[PDB]
Design a protein around this ligand. Structure first.
Ligand SMILES: Nc1ncnc2c1ncn2[C@@H]1O[C@H](COP(=O)(O)OP(=O)(O)OP(O)(O)=S)[C@@H](O)[C@H]1O
Ligand SMILES: Nc1ncnc2c1ncn2[C@@H]1O[C@H](COP(=O)(O)OP(=O)(O)OP(O)(O)=S)[C@@H](O)[C@H]1O
Ligand SMILES: [Mg+2]
Ligand SMILES: [Mg+2]
Lengths: 183, 528, 183, 528
């Protein structure tokens, strides 16, 4: 009965909901504001999951990338002044690539990358970011977008179709056994 | 009546009576009992994992889990021993119906305890280890003992790299100090205090808690066989505990040291009257942050003797420790060997689950096998005033949370009941008042509640938050007896939520019980 | 005559000016706004230097840290939603620590760190950030602040005390030789 | 008159006359001349680094920089050679007063060229290499040559790992194809085109530029001895160039390939008439991005023969290349040996500086030794309309810039004059109009100007931006002759600013000249 996998999300609907929030285009002025708002909520939710314990690496990566993208296109006294955005992007990529390579390992960085199917460009970008002179905003922007689409193919698309009364002992005559969590 | 065998050894008249065994031995002989049993030396002298029992002694219960190293028993010339069957063990055994891991941990025979004879026992996947000891270890212990007998209450600081023997050595040291009875006409037993500063795999407390314990009887059982000693003739009692809410002291070093100070302070107060040696076992870090922590600990406590269980450790850690030791101008620093499957994670988890199944009240501590789901929860109110509410609020450690998320994040995890002693604790937080939402106490900084004015009163497992009505309430279940819970006025009681490693075993437990005896279980994804 | 060191900044005054902008406290509602504004300008300037080519590693690190800090304490629809800030911080630390360790190398991470004088805490934080679960905002915040003070001691404090007329050939009768750059 | 020595070898009557040397040789003999000299085979036949000269030939100038491998000269039976002193070499020599690196690069004797005899030359820190060649290399070249003589204009794609011999091999191949004269009654020389797709250490262009060159004479000199061939009987002419603005094609692969396409297109057009083989030398990447680029290049160009100069390369790169090669259904793929201090950085820098000192007018190209600071700059206007301004604006590659910073960032660096052919280039940018600030053309995307509608017209060094007056102007100095500059109406001319590796040598140059001949130099911190 080792057929028990534990997840931080309560059930399946919640996971699908988060998926929808992240990728409105595939799942499908005021409308734009709505979309942005939902994305923010999704990111926060994922953060909670991470703390709870046990979370697919892909989910964490997606969250990071989306958070960075949101920060970049934020007008109104708070657009990070350009250098911060470039840092957020670099961090996201480093974590994403490190995770993928570390997972499918028994070789060299590029060899593993090719085996998995990860375009070498990402590996190079990661290496460059870590050791020398964080890349330019334009490259990071385009790369991040591609990364999201790739992640969609590799993971998300397979998760389903696309449509002193302070302490009173509970009365031992009204209680009914029920799983931990439900009320 | 002459049973002889490689691991164990010879014996003599073996009288079976009423379920117990009266065995006579006319010569030095070693046995390796397995299971749950009680020893009561009728005549002579016997040694058990560091202790020594003579005719003037009470029955001593021994738990020999198939996991660790079965305690070896050595009998001396002209002895008669009476082996009694342990009662409360039955409850613990039944715990196998709630988790297959607790199944393979004892004898799979009929009675409660089975002797062994090289291989005539130890069912499939034996891996039957045995408690041994280099002569060096024993010699050193002897030295410490004799030195102690001519000085005040010593302080022994035990440290070393992971899987080195810190715990086992501590076990032996404690038992020897207590039981010794060198020649002062038995002085029957000298009490002993143990300071556990290891949140990882603790001893005398559930994972994630630091604590100070007082022992009157020899410690002859693994950690998951008494993870929740009674709070407050009382073989083992807990003097004070503090919650760190992490399985790694590397989330707030300042707090860790602060806790160490408070606990040691209490020890100082108690020691001042009756001479009682203190044995402290530290974590298993030997590089970076951990090494620094160890240095500070040595400075703060000022241990009389430092024992490093490596003898081939890296020059960096050894040098650092020696420097720190030298600084306090006079501290003996010695090194010992190490003698180097159940991973730490699983062992820790077992400790936790055992704790939650502890019965609210022998010889030791009884256990209740009924699954947690069936138990009736404690209904705490969340709508009133700080005099008719119960819980003063919810504080978060090392991480904040948006209001909305909190309800979902808290639900299902393990938190800790912290009792406020002096109001000079929440001094710096926006404490909610009269006031539907959870009374969350915003804590921007993130630092945990000070240890000087707050004490842990056991852990709590939440089984359902329902704040959608006109009676916000929290259903939580704990092991703490009702007596203590009711005596707190509700105005001084806050719940601390940190890491704790989500108790995944809880959810499955119900399912196992139902199937073994022979539907939208949250967080459990059934593979079919 | 190998006594020629090239710098991206034109002269010394400019470098000192940047130093002043970064650390107002030591160098010394409306006032707060002023300080923030200046810090932003300094960060941008450093970015330019980096592109120009040749720049002390410490300067780059300082810029990154300050940029992150600024992003964190920005109110007004643009505070990065918490996850981005944590990413910016992680990236800054990774770059900073990697640089210091790489420079003073011929050992182990911790050994080199101890040799330089870098509190092990930073090394650990870096390692953790790269491989597993970006640390919590509180730790990053405090760490960053300490990092800045340390950098001040190690580098900044030693830089000085603390107090078709489209193309017309230039007239070969009015020109006077003068270094490249001055006009 | 019989000079014999290990590295060189025997000779005969050596007649010194007017400054030149008439040397007779009655038997096969090898010489290793060093410096700057001219060869004019009077009678017989001689071979020089791949070329073959007979009585019916013009004087060929050879530059043998002490840096690379001195070209070896082999003379055949019954020959008389006349060695002339090169004139323009004098100007190049004087460049040593502006950079000590150019000092130790030739003979430190009296005349312009000195013969050698095993060690009687080569002053201190000799490290005097010599051009050699495995028989395999020669055999392969012979095969390619004979095959060519019976087919149309071949395309040879040369690649391989760093420091393998791609460049040297190319040199030999080019000279052989041109000079061969197998037996068709000399057909005196077949023209040859060279496509340089290596921004790193380019050949026939300054660092950071890709280009297509046409050669009528043998190439007998390093890259920094003709980095700026004349634009537009014309020994070497440049057909088209494109600016990549980086020393690494790993900043915009799409652009790199696009450039390759455009240049090859022109080659196709020219080739269509007169048969002219094309030799292309690629970068030195063999893993990751670079490998992919190489694959694409092979697909686009469809080279007739691929030469990999490794013979022990990693299985990954070799396999990848073989697959790509196979894809075009028929491409011979061969491998050759490699035969494995002046680092690439310094060499590249030298190329750049040499370029900027090129005189505006082989035999070759004259040089002007006057320091850049003294030269009179080109005054371009920055206030008017797109018909009375000069520069249409400033575009940035791979990186943006805040308005204010731009003035400081641009100043002092190297940029490129790009001529717009068709207005379908700036289609997608907010082109400034009439309009004090620099007319910056905002480019959000960051991609470089398309290669189909834009061409590079040489590089420019800016020596001072002064936009604080009522006549905004830019003082910039370039090598481009006035004739070309004036013929552009100013409406089609934009400046591209990328990486280029800040020309640090420029600043110091003035100081060196002043001191050698024997004050707030921006960006230079003098150590005292
Ligand atoms: N002399 C010995 N006799 C019996 N078992 C031993 C002996 N030395 C080591 N062991 C085994 O070593 C293992 C580790 O023992 P511990 O004393 O727990 O070491 P430790 O340093 O406490 O490990 P950590 O770091 O706390 S998880 C146990 O399972 C023992 O069975
Ligand atoms: N057969 C040879 N004869 C003479 N010199 C050789 C020979 N083989 C290699 N070398 C030396 O090898 C060095 C590199 O030669 P190149 O042909 O430039 O190699 P490369 O692959 O072009 O190097 P990169 O990647 O372009 S920097 C030169 O300095 C030559 O002197
Ligand atoms: Mg232990
Ligand atoms: Mg080359």
């Amino acid at each position: 009965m080792v057929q028990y996998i534990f997840t931080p999300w309560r059930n399946r609907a919640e996971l699908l909901a988060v998926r929808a929030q992240f990728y409105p285009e595939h799942t499908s002025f005021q409308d734009d504001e709505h979309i942005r708002s939902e994305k923010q909520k999704a990111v926060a939710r994922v953060s909670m999951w991470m703390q709870r314990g046990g979370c697919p690496h892909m989910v964490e990566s997606t969250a990071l990338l989306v958070a960075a993208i949101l920060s970049d296109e934020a007008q109104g006294s708070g657009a990070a002044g350009g250098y911060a955005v470039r840092a957020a992007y670099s961090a996201a990529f480093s974590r994403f690539v490190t995770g993928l390579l570390d997972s499918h390992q028994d070789q060299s960085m590029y060899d593993v990358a090719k085996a998995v199917g990860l375009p070498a460009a990402f590996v190079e970008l990661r290496h460059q970011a870590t050791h020398e002179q964080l890349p330019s905003l334009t490259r990071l922007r385009s790369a991040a977008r591609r990364a999201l689409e790739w992640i969609w193919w590799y993971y998300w698309k397979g998760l389903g179709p696309v449509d002193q009364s302070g302490w009173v002992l509970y009365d031992e005559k009204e209680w009914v056994p029920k799983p931990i969590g439900i009320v | 009546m002459h049973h002889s065998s490689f691991q164990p050894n010879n014996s003599n008249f073996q009288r079976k009576a009423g379920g117990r065994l009266v065995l006579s031995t006319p010569d030095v002989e070693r046995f390796v009992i397995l299971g749950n049993y009680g020893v009561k030396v009728h005549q002579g002298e016997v040694t058990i994992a560091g202790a020594t029992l003579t005719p003037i002694d009470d029955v001593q219960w021994v738990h020999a889990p198939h996991c660790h190293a079965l305690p070896v028993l050595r009998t001396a010339n002209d002895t008669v021993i009476e082996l009694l069957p342990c009662p409360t063990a039955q409850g613990l055994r039944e715990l196998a119906r709630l988790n297959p891991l607790f199944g393979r941990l004892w004898n799979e025979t009929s009675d409660t305890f089975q002797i062994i004879y090289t291989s005539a026992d130890a069912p499939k996947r034996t891996s039957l280890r045995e408690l041994a000891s280099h002569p060096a270890w024993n010699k050193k212990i002897s030295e410490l003992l004799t030195s102690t007998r001519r000085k005040p209450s010593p302080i022994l600081f035990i440290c070393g790299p992971k899987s080195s023997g810190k715990s086992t050595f501590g076990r032996l040291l404690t038992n020897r100090l207590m039981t010794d009875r060198a020649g002062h006409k038995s002085r029957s037993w000298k009490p002993v205090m143990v300071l556990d500063l290891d949140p990882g795999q603790p001893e005398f407390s559930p994972p994630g808690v630091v604590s100070l314990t007082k022992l009157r009887r020899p410690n002859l059982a693994p950690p998951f066989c008494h993870p929740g000693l009674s709070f407050g003739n009382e073989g083992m009692t807990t003097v004070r505990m503090h919650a760190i809410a992490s399985v790694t002291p590397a989330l707030d070093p300042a707090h860790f040291i602060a806790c160490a100070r408070d606990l040691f302070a209490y020890y100082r107060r108690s020691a001042s009257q009756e001479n009682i040696p203190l044995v402290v076992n530290t974590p298993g870090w030997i590089q970076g942050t951990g090494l620094d922590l160890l240095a500070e600990l040595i400075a703060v406590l000022r241990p009389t003797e430092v024992l490093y269980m490596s003898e081939d450790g890296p020059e960096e850690t050894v040098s650092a420790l020696r420097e720190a030791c030298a600084s306090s101008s006079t501290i003996p620093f010695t090194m010992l060997p190490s003698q180097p499957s159940w991973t730490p994670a699983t062992l820790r988890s077992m400790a936790m689950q055992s704790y939650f199944h502890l019965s609210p009240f022998g010889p030791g501590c009884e256990w209740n096998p009924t699954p947690l789901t069936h138990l009736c929860p404690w209904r705490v109110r969340l709508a009133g005033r700080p005099d008719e509410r119960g819980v003063l609020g919810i504080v978060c450690y090392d991480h904040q949370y948006a209001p909305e998320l909190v309800s979902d994040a808290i639900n299902g995890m393990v938190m800790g009941l912290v009792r406020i002693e002096k109001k000079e604790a929440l001094r710096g937080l926006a404490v909610p008042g009269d006031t539907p939402l959870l009374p969350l106490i915003p804590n921007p900084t993130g630092s945990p509640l000070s240890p000087q004015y707050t004490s842990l009163v056991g852990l709590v497992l939440i089984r359902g938050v329902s704040l959608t009505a006109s009676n916000p309430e929290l259903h939580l279940l704990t092991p703490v007896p009702p007596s203590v819970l009711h005596s707190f006025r509700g105005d001084e009681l806050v719940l601390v939520a940190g890491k704790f490693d989500a108790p995944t075993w809880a959810y499955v437990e119900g399912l196992y019980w139902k199937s073994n005896s022979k539907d939208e279980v949250p967080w459990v994804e059934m593979l079919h």
